[model samples]
Target: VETSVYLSELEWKSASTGYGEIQKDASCDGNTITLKGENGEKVSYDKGIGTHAHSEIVYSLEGLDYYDYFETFVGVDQEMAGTVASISFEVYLDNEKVFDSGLMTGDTTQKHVKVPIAGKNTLKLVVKDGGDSIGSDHGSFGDAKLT
Candidate 1:
């Protein structure tokens, strides 16, 4: 179902995790979570999944804050950094995963995935390093709106 109101994951509480600051660039204003990896692994993520190689974000949406159902999309995007990388994406509803993208790589255009957010209070989106290093891997969510 299509929705009129819009709520980007970036507009959410940005979670209370260690995903660190949202990277800003021409491609990703504030919608992309750029892993801060100095070496080849992720670091300083609040509630990441991997051993300094994963990242997580939280969204609080109870019944219907603005609509009947909440439909959103999650993806990976390496807007900046070396040449971008791959990562396994996960969508957790109220603490349990409801949707998952095994592994995503390449440009941001090929990594879009619809997520679940219906009749739930909390949403947790996660990204884990697919390769040996975080490199330029980043994660994001879109279509985070209610309808």
Candidate 2:
């Protein structure tokens, strides 16, 4: 029998953010935290990774070869939607950029990405500032999982 692996369920090798804090299975707004997002109107994911732009969350896939690919929805948190929040979401496997979501603002709909990871050893979830600034760029990875 096989089971799904969620990002929040795995131990991250490293998680770094540009500003604010990194959260697992929740969203961050300054010093506070919420189940939804900064705007409190976004879809509340039961399992998600929330952080700011210019961030990288790395995980190891060395011993786990059963999983083939990773999938997730990426976008700015609803709380930052009304702000100047713009970011790009990316997935790097073994230093190869497999998935990239172009500059997305608060008002832009979340993008769904599915990247193959078979025989890969490292997985990196990246968020970059959308050319403007990092302020208010609350990025969310909704239901990030491997299977």
Candidate 3:
């Protein structure tokens, strides 16, 4: 049997090194995690583990049975300080890649992707530096729903 858990932005606090002072506005309404920036702009945060210095909020799903359906909603900013060399969203199941996206650019549009989940899944969003641009950051993730 599969169970569902909803995490809001309020439930997420910055785990970034020395960035705890960076205030974030987020909430979990229904099945989405909404994040608002300093200027009240919506931003997609870097959830990549090894790639970035910060890690998105981590939650423990204790009682829910693992399912195959995992869906993510994301929105990115058009203008960033640094050039977005390569940005991709990745989902990992037990430290394994189950879903990955192409390198994203400044012109990259917002997207939502749904994929099959494996046993004990852990999801992450990875953005990398492709060129002289040392990688850009600014994005928001909607609440995640697993079925």
Candidate 4:
């Protein structure tokens, strides 16, 4: 049998953000993990971690004897659709960067990321300010899963 768990369903080792506090199962500032594309298409995930740019959230996987990978859909939140919401999403396994979503803006479509983490001691999720200002740089890990 195989096991799987959503990020929101697990307790994080630590979570922090530059602009505001990290949120579980919700957007950085909003109540839901909803992403809106440039053309007004909206998508939402049932469970995930939320944070602003310049943030890091860590989770432990020591209890899992074996696991395959970590996957999640990422993007700027709809709450900052009309503003300059510039940010980037990243994932790290044992402090080494594994996945990176290039700088994304409010209107950008969501991107999916998956990385192998077998035997890794720690899983870290990050959001950067897109090398500019951090205003409205809200980001999220939608439907984040480990299996």
Question: Largest lDDT belongs to which candidate?
Answer: 4
| Residue 12, model 4, lDDT | 85
Per-residue lDDT over 71-113 for candidate 2, one digit per residue giving the tens place of the 0 to 100 score: 8878887766568888998899997999888988877877778
Model 2: residues >4 Å from true position, as ranges?
Answer: 30-41
Position 37, candidate 1: lDDT: 37
What is the Cα-based TM-score of model 4? 0.91
Error of 4 at 77 (Å): 0.9
Q: What lDDT does each candidate get?
A: 0.49, 0.80, 0.41, 0.85
Candidate 1: lDDT of 85? 67
Kindly provide the TM-score of model 1 when superposed on the true structure, using C-alpha atoms.
Answer: 0.58
Which pairs clash in the backbone of model 2?
Answer: 38-79, 39-78, 39-79
- TM agreement with the true structure for every prediction: 0.58, 0.87, 0.52, 0.91
Each prediction's total of clashing residue pairs, residues at least 3 apart in sequence or on different chains, is: 4, 3, 14, 0
**Candidate 1 lDDT, tens digit per residue, 16-117?**
322455332211334333343325442222221221127666656753454555454444543443465666776777867777777666443433345545
Lowest lDDT 10-residue stretch of candidate 1: 43-52
Tell me the alpha-carbon RMSD of every candidate.
8.7, 3.5, 7.6, 1.9
**Model 1: residues with Cα > 4 Å off, grouped in runs:** 1-5, 9-20, 23-53, 63-69, 78-84, 107-112
The top-ranked prediction according to TM-score is: 4
Clashing pairs in 4: none
